[PDB]
Ligand binder design. Structure first.
Ligand SMILES: [Cu+2]
Ligand SMILES: [Cu+2]
Ligand SMILES: [Zn+2]
Ligand SMILES: [Zn+2]
Lengths: 155, 155
């Protein structure tokens, strides 16, 4: 079985747009995230589980900012460090980056070896960023994902 | 402790070009392959350990085939099935696909959770294909990777 996460491209002004789903399954080596997404910007994108079960915007420094309602990276073990999916020093929410092909589709599965059971990711959000992910806070915070492009709540 | 694998772009007629290295390290969750490659074709490429410690071409039907001296996918258990990096029913050498950015660089690390110690992969080859990898023999054999584009021997 699979958790089916509906994902939307975020637009706080005009309303989110559906871009498909990400399926989460259990493998013998951890949780697999299998995207079935469309109409996204081509490239490799930061892909993380964020703390709050929300994809809503929040105002910050006078701005209505996409996805801020999700809070920060999911970090139950309180490492306070963005890092690699296979590093025990990194946020539990840190997943391998997600590849979107030329035609805007994403169908390449990725493994989160530190996550072991479907139950454990529910009540959090799944975030796809505009930027990539160097799995460090240096030199850009949170791997340089930057803006929150697409998001779905894990239920 | 690491293995540094020198990688060459394969051209049996005009000569193989040095395109960098891939560093293999041990993580708490299996082997991590960290590429440091340049001047490769952009996109997502099939990435596997092949059986033989060779990147040499081999004649077939009167023509040299790039990388054919590497033999098939490394499959010590003789599953005879191309599959996911996280599936125990798949070739032991099946790694996550390798992403090359538009500038020709590959620097995105990937985890092979079924591989646990550096000793396991010594005496084999590391292959990068022209095509991608859907982690099945359906609809295309060996994930659709097709031609052998770059290769290094793991020592
Ligand atoms: Cu994020
Ligand atoms: Cu191969
Ligand atoms: Zn993080
Ligand atoms: Zn294979």
């Amino acid at each position: 079985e699979k958790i089916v996460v509906p994902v939307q491209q975020l637009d706080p002004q005009n309303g989110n747009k559906d871009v498909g789903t990400v399926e989460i399954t259990e493998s013998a080596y951890g949780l697999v995230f299998t995207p079935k997404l469309h109409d996204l910007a081509h490239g490799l994108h930061g892909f993380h589980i964020h703390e709050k079960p929300s994809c809503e915007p929040k105002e910050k420094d006078g701005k209505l900012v996409a996805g801020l309602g999700a809070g920060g990276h999911w970090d139950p073990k309180q490492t306070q460090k963005h890092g690699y999916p296979w590093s025990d020093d990194a946020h539990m929410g840190d997943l391998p980056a997600l590849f979107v092909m030329h035609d805007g589709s994403a169908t390449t599965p990725v493994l989160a070896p530190r996550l072991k059971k479907l139950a454990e990711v529910k009540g959090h959000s799944l975030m796809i960023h505009a930027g990539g992910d160097n799995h460090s806070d240096h030199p850009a915070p949170l791997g340089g994902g930057g803006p929150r492009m697409a998001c779905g709540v894990i239920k």
